[PDB]
């Protein structure tokens, strides 16, 4: 079980670690988070108490280095940093644990929520969507735009999600206009799966990462990408049975985890009504249809 | 975006544009079967593609053979329309290609956008105008070429005859839409008004009668009266 120590907490802030969150007071004796499960990506996220403007945070994998948080009073944010001195890092963590200055990652033994949300998410794939090659961890915030949003401005600070556009030459074979527009199977199976993602696991990893950035940061371009990747599958007449079954599980846990009070801003009425009731796959998402009907029957 | 009463002069500017009306593409008669079920029988249709500035009409005849063994024909008809408009654009020299295509029905927007992805600089637009182009099949010479067709065919017409020798495009479009609105509202009465006087004939190379300027003013008056007469008949007003 790994540790992300904090140098200090000089400004009042709500701290998130994955699906959990904790309020920390201005200059509270807080020195970080311990007992973080090895085997998963994680996200450590922030919303300042004095300025709920910019939610921001860091994706990381404790298997890939020793990470800590330190407030930067020039840039006015909590920064992730890597400690390359293993023995220095081990001594820091030991002292903070001995003085019980750390919160414990509060995982219930029965609870597979985080695995179910991150099953296909890989830190190496995150670092290709969020390009900052000198760090092993990835910064995301509320306002970062996608490559697709920037086509329709600073490219170094963009979310490089795979561009999906139903009315693009990429989506539509010359001579199969009606076929390819009404049945997206070509675009899903040949262009995206065989062509760009190589396999369903990579496609689901991007879908899951887009959901998590939409939920944890209120990132609008991430929410657009999550819905586009769901709609591309639901709008395809020919999808492998294993991919439909896995999508139903993925979406079930995403709808389960969404705070009830954010449903209005995080869920697209047209896409969900189309996916559940009109599309080729309207009968293929039993678990997702049941949780959506019981939790968000207004949206539908 | 959308074409309306505000931006109406735009129809007659020097940017090449075409109206596309798909109303008469898929045409059927509904009839009883021997078992007392209902079945359709398709008849020949047409795409109505019109340059409002020049009067040039690209009448693409849709022969019933293009429906044989196809399903969901009202959906296919929109895509076949888009396919044939795209083929027409690609057939025209670059300097003749439209800058804008206006569809009379919003259901044509996605099919036409998808068929025209190769032409990103041709704007595909809807219109808020209620245009009477469904009545094109009330023009005897257009109805005749459509029903006689034994195979797919494109026929070229000038829907303004020689009017642009004497009047502006704006006025020619006004006259055409009034005539088509009257034919749509009361076909029998409209044709009676146009063909009442045997001394005024249709030239072999024309669609409409050879009215002098003063006779067109009388015809236009009689067409407006018909539309008002029919409005009173419909609403008991």
UniProtKB/Swiss-Prot annotation, chain A:
Q: Report the residues modified as Phosphoserine.
A: 236
The answer on whether this UniProt entry bears the keyword Transmembrane reads: no
Its annotated compartments are: Cytoplasm; Nucleus
| Signal peptide start-end | none
Show the segment(s) annotated as Leucine-zipper. 244-265
Other known facts: Present with 7330 molecules/cell in log phase SD medium.
According to its UniProt record, which protein family does this protein belong to?
Answer: Belongs to the AAR2 family.
Assembly and interaction partners: Heterodimer. Interacts with PRP8 (via RNase H homology domain and MPN domain), competing with BRR2 for the same binding site. Component of a U5 snRNP complex that contains at least the U5 snRNA, PRP8, SNU114, AAR2, SMB1, SMD1, SMD2, SMD3, SME1, SMX2 and SMX3, but is not a component of the U4/U6-U5 tri-snRNP complex.
Q: What does this protein do?
A: Component of the U5 snRNP complex that is required for spliceosome assembly and for pre-mRNA splicing. Involved in splicing pre-mRNA of the A1 cistron and other genes that are important for cell growth.
What is the protein name for this chain? A1 cistron-splicing factor AAR2
What organism does the UniProt record list as the source? Answer: Saccharomyces cerevisiae (strain ATCC 204508 / S288c)
Q: What is the lineage of its organism?
A: Eukaryota, Fungi, Dikarya, Ascomycota, Saccharomycotina
| Gene encoding the protein | AAR2
UniProtKB/Swiss-Prot annotation, chain B:
Q: What is this protein called?
A: Pre-mRNA-splicing factor 8
Please give the function described in this protein's UniProt entry.
Answer: Functions as a scaffold that mediates the ordered assembly of spliceosomal proteins and snRNAs. Required for association of BRR2 with the spliceosomal U5 snRNP, and the subsequent assembly of the U4/U6-U5 tri-snRNP complex. Functions as a scaffold that positions spliceosomal U2, U5 and U6 snRNAs at splice sites on pre-mRNA substrates, so that splicing can occur. Interacts with both the 5' and the 3' splice site, as well as the branch region. Has a role in branch site-3' splice site selection. Associates with the branch site-3' splice 3'-exon region. Also has a role in cell cycle.
What the entry says about domains is: The MPN (JAB/Mov34) domain has structural similarity with deubiquitinating enzymes, but lacks the residues that would bind the catalytic metal ion. Contains a region with structural similarity to reverse transcriptase, presenting the classical thumb, fingers and palm architecture, but lacks enzyme activity, since the essential metal-binding residues are not conserved.
What outcome follows a substitution of residue 105 to K?
A: Severely impaired growth. Reduced growth at 30 degrees Celsius. Strongly reduced growth at 16 degrees Celsius
> Organism's domain of life?
Eukaryota
In the complete protein, the residues contained here run: 1836 to 2069 of 2413
Q: Where in the cell is it found?
A: Nucleus
An additional note in the Swiss-Prot or TrEMBL entry is: Present with 468 molecules/cell in log phase SD medium.
Q: What is the lineage of its organism?
A: Eukaryota, Fungi, Dikarya, Ascomycota, Saccharomycotina
Describe the protein's quaternary organization and the partners it interacts with. Answer: Component of the U4/U6-U5 tri-snRNP complex composed of the U4, U6 and U5 snRNAs and at least PRP3, PRP4, PRP6, PRP8, PRP18, PRP31, PRP38, SNU13, SNU23, SNU66, SNU114, SPP381, SMB1, SMD1, SMD2, SMD3, SMX2, SMX3, LSM2, LSM3, LSM4, LSM5, LSM6, LSM7, LSM8, BRR2 and DIB1.
Q: Where is this region: RNase H homology domain?
A: 7-237
């Amino acid at each position: 079980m790994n540790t992300v120590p904090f140098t200090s907490a000089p400004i009042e802030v709500t701290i998130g670690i994955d699906q959990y969150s904790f309020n920390v007071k201005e200059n509270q004796p807080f020195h970080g988070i311990k007992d973080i499960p090895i085997g998963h990506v994680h996200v450590i996220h922030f919303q300042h108490a004095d300025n709920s403007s910019m939610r921001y945070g860091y994706w990381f994998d404790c298997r890939m280095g020793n990470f800590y948080i330190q407030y930067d009073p020039k840039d006015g944010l909590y920064k992730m940093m890597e400690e390359r001195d293993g023995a220095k890092f081990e001594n820091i963590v030991h002292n903070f644990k001995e003085r019980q200055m750390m919160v414990s990652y509060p995982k219930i033994d029965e609870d597979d929520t985080w695995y179910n949300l991150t099953e296909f998410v890989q830190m190496d794939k995150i670092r290709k969507i969020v390009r900052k090659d000198e760090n092993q961890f990835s910064y995301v915030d509320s306002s970062m735009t996608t490559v697709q949003e920037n086509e329709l401005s600073d490219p170094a600070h963009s979310l490089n999600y795979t561009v999906i556009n139903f009315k693009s030459r990429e989506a539509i074979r010359p001579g199969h206009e009606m076929e390819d527009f009404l049945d997206k199977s070509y675009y899903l199976n040949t262009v995206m799966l065989q062509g760009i993602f190589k396999n369903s696991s990579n496609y689901f990893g991007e879908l899951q990462f887009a959901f998590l950035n939409a939920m944890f940061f209120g990132n609008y371009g991430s929410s657009l990408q999550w819905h586009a990747m769901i709609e591309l599958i639901c709008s395809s007449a020919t999808v492998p049975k294993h991919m439909l079954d896995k999508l139903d599980e993925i979406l079930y846990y995403q709808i389960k985890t969404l705070p009830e009070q954010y449903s209005d801003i995080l869920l697209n009425e047209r896409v969900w009504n189309i996916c559940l009731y009109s599309s080729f796959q309207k009968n293929s998402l039993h678990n997702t249809e049941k949780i959506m009907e019981n939790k968000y029957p207004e949206l539908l | 975006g959308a074409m309306n009463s505000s931006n109406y002069a735009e129809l007659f500017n020097n940017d090449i544009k075409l109206f596309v009306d798909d109303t008469n593409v898929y045409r059927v008669t509904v009839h009883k079967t021997f078992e007392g079920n209902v079945a359709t029988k398709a008849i020949n249709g047409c795409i109505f593609t019109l340059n409002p500035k020049t009067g040039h009409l690209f009448l693409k005849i849709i022969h019933t053979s293009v429906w044989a063994g196809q399903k969901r024909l009202s959906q296919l008809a929109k895509w076949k329309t888009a396919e044939e408009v795209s083929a027409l654009v690609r057939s025209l020299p670059k300097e003749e290609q439209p800058k804008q295509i206006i569809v009379t029905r919003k259901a044509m927007l996605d099919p036409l956008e998808v068929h025209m992805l190769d032409f990103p600089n041709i704007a595909i637009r809807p219109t808020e105008l209620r245009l009477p182009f469904s009545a094109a099949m009330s023009i005897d010479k257009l109805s005749d070429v459509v029903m006689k067709a034994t195979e797919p065919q494109m026929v070229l017409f000038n829907i303004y005859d020689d009017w642009l020798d004497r009047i502006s495009s704006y006025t020619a479009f006004s006259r055409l839409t009034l005539l088509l609105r009257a034919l749509k509202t009361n076909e029998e009465s409209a044709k009676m008004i146009l063909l009442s006087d045997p001394t005024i004939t249709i030239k072999s190379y024309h669609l409409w009668p050879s009215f002098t300027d003063e006779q067109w003013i009388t015809i236009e008056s009689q067409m407006r009266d018909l539309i008002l007469t029919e409005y009173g008949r419909k609403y008991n007003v």
